[PDB]
Amino acid sequence: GSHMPPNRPGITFEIGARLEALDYLQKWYPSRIEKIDYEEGKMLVHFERWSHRYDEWIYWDSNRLRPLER
């Protein structure tokens, strides 16, 4: 079934919402949520300024996600 997203401080689980993501080369980038899979519990993250070929599915409990600084 579809799952309510976890409580994650500072992250809004909406399409287009911004956050920072750690890419596969271990650098943080401002990013936005492209898609949310509520069944598998993961989101398609787009790294801002970069090609969509780098869009990555990240599980929504991942420590590779952090909120923007408020």
Side-chain angles (χ1 to χ4, degrees), residues 21-25 27 29-32 34 43-58 64:
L22 197 65
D23 83 339
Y24 62 101
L25 300 177
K27 186 170 183 194
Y29 293 90
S31 294
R32 65 164 175 273
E34 291 293 280
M43 58 192 25
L44 184 60
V45 175
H46 173 71
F47 301 91
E48 288 182 342
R49 309 177 183 183
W50 293 85
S51 169
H52 283 276
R53 286 190 218 251
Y54 296 109
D55 292 1
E56 176 173 7
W57 286 102
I58 302 188
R64 300 176 55 211

Side-chain angles (χ1 to χ4, degrees), residues 4-43:
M4 177 76 72
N7 170 14
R8 291 212 56 182
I11 293 171
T12 301
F13 292 91
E14 292 166 28
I15 303 308
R18 296 177 80 235
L19 65 182
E20 293 177 340
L22 197 65
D23 83 339
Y24 62 101
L25 300 177
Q26 308 182 248
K27 186 170 183 194
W28 293 102
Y29 293 90
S31 294
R32 65 164 175 273
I33 297 168
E34 291 293 280
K35 316 179 142 135
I36 298 167
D37 183 336
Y38 293 98
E39 323 283 358
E40 303 198 18
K42 56 188 192 185
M43 58 192 25

